[PDB]
Amino acid sequence: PQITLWKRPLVTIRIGGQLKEALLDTGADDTVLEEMNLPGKWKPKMIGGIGGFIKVRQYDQIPVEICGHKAIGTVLVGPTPVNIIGRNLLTQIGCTLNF
Amino acid sequence: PQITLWKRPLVTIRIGGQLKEALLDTGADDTVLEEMNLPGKWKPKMIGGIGGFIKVRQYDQIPVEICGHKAIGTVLVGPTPVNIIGRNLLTQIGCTLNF
Ligand SMILES: OC1(c2ccc(Cl)cc2)CCN(CCCC2(c3ccc(F)cc3)SCCS2)CC1
Ligand SMILES: OC1(c2ccc(Cl)cc2)CCN(CCCC2(c3ccc(F)cc3)SCCS2)CC1
Numbered sequence: 001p002q003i004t005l006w007k008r009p010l011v012t013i014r015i016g017g018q019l020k021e022a023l024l025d026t027g028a029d030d031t032v033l034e035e036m037n038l039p040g041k042w043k044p045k046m047i048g049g050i051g052g053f054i055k056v057r058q059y060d061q062i063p064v065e066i067c068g069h070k071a072i073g074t075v076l077v078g079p080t081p082v083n084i085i086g087r088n089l090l091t092q093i094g095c096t097l098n099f
Numbered sequence: 100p101q102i103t104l105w106k107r108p109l110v111t112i113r114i115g116g117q118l119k120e121a122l123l124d125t126g127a128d129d130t131v132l133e134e135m136n137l138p139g140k141w142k143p144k145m146i147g148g149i150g151g152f153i154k155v156r157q158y159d160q161i162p163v164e165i166c167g168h169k170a171i172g173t174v175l176v177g178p179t180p181v182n183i184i185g186r187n188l189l190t191q192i193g194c195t196l197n198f
């Protein structure tokens with residue numbers, strides 16, 4: 001698709017057979033999702049954003065379907081204000097910025 | 100141009116006669132720039148990101164040139180390590196997400 005940006009680029013993703021709304025965010029390096037329980041061993045990780053550092057659990061090789069497109073990659077879970085799909089998965093679905 | 104997301108989408112912008120680099124950020128509603136002195140009146144705002152809130156100063160009708168494209172709009176100035184171009188200016192230069 002072509003998504004214009006007069007509205008937030010909020011998309012339905014499915015992960016763990018859960019449907020969630022997430023923002024397509026070219027300014028985020030990583031995908032970070034609101035607290036949820038995923039099967040698997042996780043690494044604790046601290047990540048920094050503008051208001052400060054948050055503590056997240058790192059899950060690798062998680063399958064995620066984003067607007068009908070499959071991706072397999074790291075998901076960081078923790079206290080983000082919104083579900084954010086960052087560049088590690090936007091690259092996998094072939095996403096580019098155009099102007 | 101078409102920008103892939105293998106790396107951070109940093110582009111060159113010009114404000115005043117200052118040459119700066121900035122992150123193209125589809126998840127940001129607002130443009131937030133590093134601490135600088137701009138013309139006109141401003142009002143404080145609190146904006147929250149990952150990690151919490153920062154206080155910024157709001158300037159309206161600032162001309163910003165981003166990859167040779169002219170935009171004019173509100174800019175929030177605050178303590179950020181990166182200049183972030185949000186959706187309010189991204190629509191002005193006709194930028195879209197595509198996959
Ligand atoms: O869109 C945001 C946002 C959107 C919506 C909501 Cl509700 C909250 C935040 C999330 C990302 N930040 C920009 C962070 C830029 C830096 C960075 C990039 C990626 C990363 F994972 C960590 C840091 S680049 C160098 C230091 S910060 C703006 C607001
Ligand atoms: O533009 C922001 C910004 C710009 C630049 C920088 Cl550096 C930081 C932030 C500051 C304002 N928020 C407003 C929306 C916040 C909430 C929300 C998020 C996403 C969504 F899809 C719907 C609602 S999150 C929970 C309730 S509204 C977005 C990022």
Ligand SMILES: [Cl-]
Binds near residue numbers: 049050051148150
């Ligand atoms: Cl942030």
Ligand SMILES: [Cl-]
Binds near residue numbers: 081146147
């Ligand atoms: Cl926010």
